[PDB]
Structure 1
Amino acid sequence: GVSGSCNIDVVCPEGNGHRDVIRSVAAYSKQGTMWCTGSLVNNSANDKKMYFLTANHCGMTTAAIASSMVVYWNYQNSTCRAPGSSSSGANGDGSLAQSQTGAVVRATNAASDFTLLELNTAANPAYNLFWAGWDRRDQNFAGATAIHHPNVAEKRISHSTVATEISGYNGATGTSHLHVFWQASGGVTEPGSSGSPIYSPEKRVLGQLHGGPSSCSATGADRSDYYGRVFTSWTGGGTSATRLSDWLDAAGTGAQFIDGLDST
């Protein structure tokens, strides 16, 4: 696929500290059309349930739509194309051969733009998946990392090396979103990246991409994005079908944050 040249192929050295959670992120189609990003999340039972977090606005919100979605793992460029280069802006060489079809909707809620699906098919060990940890604490972090499929193209990584802020969407009054500021010439996010995770420095999901002003041409404060917070989605709309808590902590261990779980 094709995305903005300023983006950074996950295989680049910028991915050296994220070789586990890179394997949590997938691209997916909706009714046959490549559509959005999501990612695999661990739960407090460490049981490999195929909980797959994405964005409500992507519309994977009905049993019918979830039933026909196709999830594509390990879709990324084989080599590190120099960020900013014509090559990086060109069609990549990623494979879409490792896929699975079908899911059910466990929960969804508009306010933090989240959807939690459970994929029908158990993880194929051959795909070498990773179930990422999460952190639902009410706090900002000193930096963060996005792993995402911009334009639903090959997987990219984008780093933020400044503090997050808590706000509503687009900086409105609120606490539903984490506002993440990208580096002046670093990777950003694009339509198609929605639903992609933002990770804390300890590699725990804090939220998933809703949207924002960033693009490769964006400058200043516009080079930033908003993620619907796990903190907010945890309690969500106050029912099991509108929040994360019943799924990510079904046993009720009271975990405020957990680590990831590897296929191995």
Structure 2
Amino acid sequence: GVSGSCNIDVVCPEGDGRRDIIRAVGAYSKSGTLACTGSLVNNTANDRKMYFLTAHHCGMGTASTAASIVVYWNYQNSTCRAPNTPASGANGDGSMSQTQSGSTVKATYATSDFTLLELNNAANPAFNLFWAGWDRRDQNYPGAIAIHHPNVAEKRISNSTSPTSFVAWGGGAGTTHLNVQWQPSGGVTEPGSSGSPIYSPEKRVLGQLHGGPSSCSATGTNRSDQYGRVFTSWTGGGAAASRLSDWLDPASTGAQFIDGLDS
């Protein structure tokens, strides 16, 4: 696939120390066409349920569209293409042959733009999946890491080394979204990246991509994005079919954050 040359291949050195969470991310298609990004999250029962967090706006929040999903695992460039060079902006060599299809909707909520699906098939050992931890604490972070499929192309990593802030969708005063500032010549996010996770420096999911003004040519504060907060989604719409709590903490531990689980 093709995406902006400013993006960074997950196999590059920027992926060092994050080789676990990279494996939680997948790209997917909706009714046949490539649509967005999602990723696996762990839960307090440590049972490896196929809980796949994505964005509401991608439209998989219905029985009939969730059934239609095709997930592509390990879709990434084989070699590190130097960011900000023509090679990065070129067609990648990623394989889309490790797939699974079908899922059911656990919950969905427009305000924080999240959707929790459960994939029909159990983890295939051949895929070497990872179920990421999460953090629902009401706080900001000194930086963040994005792992996504820009333009639903080869998997990329974007680093933020600026503190996050709370905003409403659109950047106005609010607390439903986390505002993330990208590096001036670093990777960003693009259409297709929606529903991709944003992780704290400690590698726990804090939210998923709603959208924002960024592109590789964006400058200043326009080189940022907004993520619907796990904190918001936790209580969500007020019931199991619109929140994350029931699903992520079935064992009722009351945990504010949890680590990931390997295959």
TM range (shorter): over 0.9
The equivalent of 1:209 in structure 2 is 209
Deviations 1:52-93 (A, max 9, x none): 000000000111111111000000000000001111101100
Pairwise CA RMSD:
0.5
- Match of 1:176, as an amino acid? T
TM-score (norm 1): 0.99
Is residue 46 of structure 1 aligned with residue 61 of structure 2? no
The Cα shift of 1:229 comes to 0.2
Structure 2: distance between partners of 1:208 and 1:62:
19
Query: Structure 1 runs of 4+ off > 4 angstroms?
Result: none
Give the TM-score taking structure 2 as reference length: 0.99
Aligned residues: 263
Amino acid at match of 1:157: I
Residue 61 of structure 1: aligned partner: 61
Quick one: distance in 1 between partners of 2:170 and 2:64?
A: 31
What is the CA–CA distance in structure 1 between the aligned matches of 2:167 and 2:68, rounded to whole Å? 34
Shift, 1:173, TM fit: 1.7
Instruction: State the Cα distance separating 1:174 from its structure 2 match.
Output: 1.0
Shift of 1:262: 0.1
Cα distance in structure 2, aligned partners of 1:195 and 1:171: 18
Question: Any unmatched runs of 5+ in structure 2?
Answer: none
User: What per-residue deviation string (whole Å, max 9, x for no partner) do you get for residues 24-62 of structure 1?
Assistant: 000000000010000000001110000000000000011
Tell me what 1:234 maps to. Answer: 234
Please give the residue correspondences for 1:1-264 in structure 2 after superposition, counting only pairs within 5 Å: 1-263=1-263
Distance in 1 (CA, whole Å) between partners of 2:257 and 2:18 is 18
Separation (CA, whole Å) in 2 of partners of 1:78 and 1:45: 34
AA matched with 1:71: V
Deviations 1:170-225 (A, max 9, x none): 21121000000000000000000000000000000000000000000000000000
SS in 1 for 2:87: coil
Q: Percent identity?
A: 78
Structure 1 residue 169: Cα displacement: 1.1
Amino acid at match of 1:125: P
Q: Measure the CA separation in 2 of the matches of 1:61 and 1:209.
A: 16
Distance (whole Å) between structure 1 residues aligned to residue 85 and residue 35 of structure 2: 25
Structure 1 residue 252: Cα displacement: 1.2
1:116 partner SS: strand
CA apart distance, 1:4: 0.3
The amino acid that maps onto 2:124 is: N
Cα deviation digits, residues 220-251 of structure 1 (max 9, x gap): 00000000000000000000000000000112
Task: Name the CA distance, whole Å, in 1 between partners of 2:176 and 2:93.
Answer: 37
Question: Is the partner of 1:115 in helix, strand or coil?
Answer: strand
SS at match of 1:23: helix
